[PDB]
Structure formats: structure tokens, C-alpha cells
Amino acid sequence: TEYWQFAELFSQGNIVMTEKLKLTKRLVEEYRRFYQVELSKKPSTHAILLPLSKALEQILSVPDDWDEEELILQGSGQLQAALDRQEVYTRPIIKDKSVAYETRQLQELEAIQIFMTTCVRDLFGEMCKGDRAILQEQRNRIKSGAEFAYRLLALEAQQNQN
RNA sequence: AGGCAUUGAAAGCGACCACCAGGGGCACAACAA
Fold this sequence. Notes:
This is CRISPR-associated protein Csc3. It is classed as rna binding protein/rna. This protein has helices at about 1-10, 15-30, 45-50, 50-60, 70-85, 90-95, 100-125, 130-160. The chain has eight helices and no strands. By secondary structure, it is mostly helical. The structure holds one RNA strand.
């Protein structure tokens, strides 16, 4: 929380930074609807960021000619393919067998889709101006900021659930 | 030894898998005259 209050402090007069800090929390607060590694098991950064690392690696690797509205479908496909390679306990929407499979699938596909839509629309399209150089220089600062955002959301959940 | 007759239908793949982890700075120099 200390290092978040510093980011929230340096951003106070600048909209483009305040927007990026709000977006970086929202971006993970969206993927935390469908993927949750438990911090108690002492996980890697690779784990905490699995959907963000596969959203960015797909946006950056695909040819620069292709549209945002196709990038979202191929990236949500890869996220769906990647989630099916993890162990089941990390997937909040599938893991509750209390609800029917065809609706667990519908909630997973829309939770992945809305996240992939935020990464391609708001991260790449809006904030990074649709430029792969500007996203490639930010890649690692986004990943660090998202790791702190994931820990802040997890701390906030484990407190406010009382 | 003769005439004859050197083939013929069909099939031309089928299933699944298209990755996995972990790293994402490390050291120092911020003025000199």
C-alpha cells in the first residue's frame, strides 16, 4: 500500500498518469475474475501475470497490419487455451461445480473477452496510442505495476471480506 | 501352334496436441576545472 500511495501521490496533477494508474488496477481487477494464484503458495511473477503476459505477448508478436477487433479474438483464444493448461483451482469461474457447465463456460468466455477487450482497446489502443514501440518500452513497467496491483487487490479482498 | 485376351472396382487417411516454466536489472558515476 505504501508504494501505491506514492504512485497515487505523484499522479495527482497529471491526467494521463492518473488514467494509467486507474487502468492498471482495473486491468488486473478484470483478470482476477477468471484467474487467481494464491499468494500464500509463494508464486512467481510469471504466475501472477499469466493473462497479462499472454495479452501483451500476442499484441506485440502479431503483424502490425491486423485490426484491434481481430486481435481480441485471437488473444482471448490464447487466454482460453492457456487457462486449460493450468490446474483447476486457479480458475474462480470453473472451480465452483455448484453451477451448470454451459453457464460456467459462458462466464469464463465473457470474463476473458472483457479483459482482452480492455488490453487491446484501453492499454494498447488508447493509452499506448496503438503503437508497438510505446507498448514494448512500457511492457516491463506495466508488468511490475500489475504485480503490485494484484497484491493490493488480494490484500483488499482478504480484508473487506470480513 | 494357332486366334484371343495382360486386368477390374473402391479406398487416398483418421484422431488429438500446438507448448511448458522462470527471469524482466545487475554495478557504480552525478559533476570536473
